[PDB]
Amino acid sequence: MKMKTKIFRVKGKFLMGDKLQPFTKELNAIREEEIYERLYSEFGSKHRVPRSKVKIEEIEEISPEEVQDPVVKALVQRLEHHHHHH
């Protein structure tokens, strides 16, 4: 069943150069089984980081308008209501 997408503010570590770098990823999904696969996909895409080297530590569900990432916040708004301002 599809719904209004939940923005999960993930806070974890990714292994690059045998070093753990911390990240704060605000991404819109439906459930946790999405979050894992979507991050393994993104880090591999944008950053070319291997899946087994991406370590998720925290997953915090936040509100659509509170999201700091402009791209994700714009993505969530695509399924929202066009504010009728005459």
Swiss-Prot record:
Keywords tagged on the record: Ribonucleoprotein, Ribosomal protein, RNA-binding, rRNA-binding
Assembly and interaction partners: Part of the 50S ribosomal subunit. Binds 23S rRNA.
Family: Belongs to the eukaryotic ribosomal protein eL20 family.
Protein's UniProt name: Large ribosomal subunit protein eL20
Gene3D superfamilies in the record: 3.10.20.10
GO terms of biological process kind: translation
Entry's Gene Ontology molecular function annotations: large ribosomal subunit rRNA binding; structural constituent of ribosome
